[PDB]
Amino acid sequence: GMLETPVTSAPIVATYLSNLPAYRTGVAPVLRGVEIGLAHGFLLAGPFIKLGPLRNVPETAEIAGSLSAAGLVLILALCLSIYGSAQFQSARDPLFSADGWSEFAAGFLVGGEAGVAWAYVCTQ
Amino acid sequence: MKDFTTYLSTAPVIATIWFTFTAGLLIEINRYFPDPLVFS
Amino acid sequence: AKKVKIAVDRNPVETSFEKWAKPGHFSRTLSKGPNTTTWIWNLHADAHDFDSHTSDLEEISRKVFSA
Amino acid sequence: EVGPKRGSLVKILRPESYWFNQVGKVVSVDQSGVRYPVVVRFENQNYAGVTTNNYALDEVVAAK
Amino acid sequence: AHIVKIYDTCIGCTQCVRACPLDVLEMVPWDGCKASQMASAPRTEDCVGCKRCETACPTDFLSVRVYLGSESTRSMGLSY
Amino acid sequence: WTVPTLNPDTPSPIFGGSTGGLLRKAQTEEFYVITWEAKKEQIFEMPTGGAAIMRQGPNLLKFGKKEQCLALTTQLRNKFKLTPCFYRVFPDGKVQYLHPADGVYPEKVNAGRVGANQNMRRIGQNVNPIKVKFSGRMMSPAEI
Amino acid sequence: PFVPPSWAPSVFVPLTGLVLPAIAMATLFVYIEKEAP
Amino acid sequence: DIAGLTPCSESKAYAKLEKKELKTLEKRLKQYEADSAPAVALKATMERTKARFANYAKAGLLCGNDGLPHLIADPGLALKYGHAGEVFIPTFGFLYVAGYIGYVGRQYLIAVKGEAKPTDKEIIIDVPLATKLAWQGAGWPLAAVQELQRGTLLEKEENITVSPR
Ligand code: CLA
Ligand code: CLA
Ligand code: CLA
Ligand code: SF4
Ligand code: SF4
């Protein structure tokens, strides 16, 4: 069969993945979308603020960077939505279905924008 | 000796001798008649 | 426990210009002579590919050593 | 009793043949009524390295 | 699927069948040649278009011809 | 000769495994199974890379595409002088048998085969492309 | 009458360079992936 | 003169060019000894430079505003004003040699086609035959024309292979 390897087949690694929102079955797709969106949204603000074109402005740097992070989350939400449209047109997990993914994309937008907003509040 | 003279008759050997001769003739002509541009 | 020793064969090959006058002698395919210009390139491409001329490792090693 | 004699030279008339309008030597002629009985050999090989080919009676004519 | 055609100049050498790396061709009885056999192409849906058969045909011009056509998972030679 | 029936419980060669094996295609579209009898345990080369030991008696392998199965068949037949046969297996459980289609390898002529895609003309006697134009689809003169 | 407002580039450049391409790409991606009935 | 050109012997720019080249050589000369090896070589170069500029002026070439010789290619203008040696005469000089080489090679190629194994006579040259044909090529224009009139120069259209059409 496939080449067995500790990275591919280990107990500690398997348990960690099984607890991630993507692999945690039994949770509504919308809730998983919010949980995933919040994590990525919070991180997405970092690089924009520190290395953006307005990074050296004292107070505008925080606003401009976070506002650009919010924009990227919006673009990503569109990518999630159209992916579901193309992939699911006609199985065990509800997420991998036309109905499930549409809820998942909506949750990501809500969670992602909340994470970006929450990141801004931490700064000020 | 027949085979050796046959080897000298191979295409690469003939070309080397022929162009060595041809080049030498042209080089020698330009040594005694330097800078020919017009027949005159 | 094969002892380390000098081992040679006497007069393995004859020194003659006969094969100098027969291009492609080293290979069975090219020994028949040219029919297309592709033969000429094949002669130079495979000249030093000893491992394909013969399947005998001893003959291959002796050519490498003298080359 | 059918086709040219063995060893004679014939000119090929198949337009799609590598040896169209070229002369080859007849090796044998099948007498079993096959589609292409005549076998011709050529001194110059084609692009695949082949020097022999089968031709029908009407695809080959005597040299000149 | 590609298109593979056998023409009546086949001499039944079987070289095309041996060359084919997907068992697309086979030999069948015939009366049009000395060998009394002809090449056949019953399984062209498995043909990939390598043209190893054409490389192996002795007749001039070829007696087996491959015309590349519509692509698919099998003809595109994909394992994924 | 009758069409063989595949035995899914046939033992497989001694192979550690590799990354060149089946992919997600096998679970969704199809895969191929090759089986043969081995006179003695021997080492052969996997078309996916590496070396495997064939058990004495029946052996079974699974491959991702047909060409891989027929590549192993050429090795076993030509070098070890065996006689393998392989199938096409679908995810629904259906099994299709092929090579040898009629039990005799295609290189050998066999009575009962029906000629297919045979044109009773030469390549030079095809019609011109203009005469097969507007036939509803791109059609070569050889097709008609 | 013809002269557009002085702020026209501010709206149309982002609109035609960032917004319409996004909708156009989404429209095309969905279209090509769409399966026949 | 012709096309607005002027004889190099009467050209101001042509004369100035010679001084520039000699001045460059003289500048390098004064860093050596009187009769050292480098000095002798430089003096030899200057002699050839002076000879070259005298020869081109003596040849009656035409110089442009650049002060460099220009050649006349029209046969009518060349023969009209005595410039036949620039292009016109060398034209028939080259063709004789070019036809010589080509005619000799064609004779050899025909000669070996009659042999049992023509291919082996091409990689391994038949030197005795080649030398024989090399000398007889001096009369190629006469032999070439006579073949044309007797109709044995060209192959018949029916003996040449061509692709389907
Ligand atoms: C790879 C090459 C590269 C890099 C490193 C940069 C870097 C930068 N560019 Mg430049 N740029 C590049 C190529 C690059 N550029 C090219 C090719 C062009 C021409 C098209 C430009 C044109 C350009 C412009 C026009 C501008 C920049 C700007 C910037 C700055 C901000 C970029 C930003 O907002 O990123 C946002 C970053 C992210 C969203 C994330 C980055 C990737 C993260 C860090 C990956 C982390 C992975 C992590 C480690 C994985 C963990 C796994 C684990 C959990 C298991 C920054 C200094 C801006 C500026 O003001 O610069 C001073 C700016 O205005 N760039
Ligand atoms: C015509 C096309 C176009 C346009 C209009 C822009 C515009 C911009 N680019 Mg560029 N960019 C483009 C093409 C374009 N880009 C392309 C093709 C590439 C790839 C080669 C890049 C790569 C690139 C990089 C790498 C970077 C830029 C950046 C920027 C910003 C520079 C000015 C600044 O300081 O912003 C400051 C920005 C703000 C103060 C915020 C503006 C608004 C944000 C981005 C979105 C807000 C969305 C809103 C909250 C919610 C949705 C609203 C919507 C539905 C209407 C600006 C937003 C820099 C930047 O800062 O990016 C974020 C930057 O680093 N661009
Ligand atoms: C490659 C083509 C070509 C071209 C464009 C020219 C061009 C020219 N030639 Mg030349 N010529 C050429 C080839 C060419 N020639 C060839 C191959 C030969 C034979 C070897 C000649 C022989 C020749 C002679 C004998 C004369 C010219 C002359 C001329 C000039 C005027 C007459 C002329 O030929 O009109 C255009 C050219 C053509 C239509 C092509 C055929 C030209 C024939 C062969 C010559 C015509 C001469 C003409 C009747 C002279 C009348 C007196 C004149 C002062 C008006 C002109 C610069 C005359 C001259 O010196 O004028 C100053 C002149 O006397 N040419
Ligand atoms: S198609 Fe060619 S290779 Fe195949 S049987 Fe016919 S002649 Fe032989
Ligand atoms: S093209 Fe390849 S797969 Fe198709 S018949 Fe020829 S050899 Fe077989």
Curated annotation (Swiss-Prot), chain B:
The chain crosses the membrane at residues 7-27. It is found in: Plastid, Chloroplast thylakoid membrane. InterPro entries: PSI_PsaJ, PSI_PsaJ_sf. One of its GO terms (cellular component) is chloroplast thylakoid membrane. It comes from the Eukaryota. It is a single-pass membrane protein. Keywords: Chloroplast, Membrane, Photosynthesis, Photosystem I, Plastid, Thylakoid, Transmembrane, Transmembrane helix. GO terms for biological process: photosynthesis. Its main location: plastid. Belongs to the PsaJ family. May help in the organization of the PsaE and PsaF subunits. PANTHER family: PHOTOSYSTEM I REACTION CENTER SUBUNIT IX (PTHR36082:SF2), PTHR36082. This is Photosystem I reaction center subunit IX. It comes from Chlamydomonas reinhardtii.
From Swiss-Prot, chain D:
The keyword Plastid applies. Its main location: plastid. GO terms for cellular component: chloroplast thylakoid membrane; photosystem I reaction center. It is found in: Plastid, Chloroplast thylakoid membrane. It is a peripheral membrane protein. Interacts with ALB3.1, which is essential for its insertion into thylakoid membrane. Belongs to the PsaE family. Stabilizes the interaction between PsaC and the PSI core, assists the docking of the ferredoxin to PSI and interacts with ferredoxin-NADP oxidoreductase. This is Photosystem I reaction center subunit IV, chloroplastic. It comes from Chlamydomonas reinhardtii. The chain holds residues 34 to 97 of 97 of the full protein.
From Swiss-Prot, chain F:
Its main location: plastid. Keywords: Chloroplast, Membrane, Photosynthesis, Photosystem I, Plastid, Thylakoid, Transit peptide. It is a peripheral membrane protein. It comes from the Eukaryota. One of its GO terms (biological process) is photosynthesis. It is found in: Plastid, Chloroplast thylakoid membrane. One of its GO terms (cellular component) is chloroplast thylakoid membrane. PsaD can form complexes with ferredoxin and ferredoxin-oxidoreductase in photosystem I (PS I) reaction center. PSAD may encode the ferredoxin-docking protein. Belongs to the PsaD family. This is Photosystem I reaction center subunit II, chloroplastic.
UniProtKB/Swiss-Prot annotation, chain H:
Keywords: Chloroplast, Photosynthesis, Photosystem I, Plastid, Thylakoid, Transit peptide. The keyword Thylakoid applies. One of its GO terms (biological process) is photosynthesis. It is found in: Plastid, Chloroplast thylakoid lumen. Belongs to the PsaF family. Probably participates in efficiency of electron transfer from plastocyanin to P700 (or cytochrome c553 in algae and cyanobacteria). This plastocyanin-docking protein contributes to the specific association of plastocyanin to PSI. This is Photosystem I reaction center subunit III, chloroplastic.
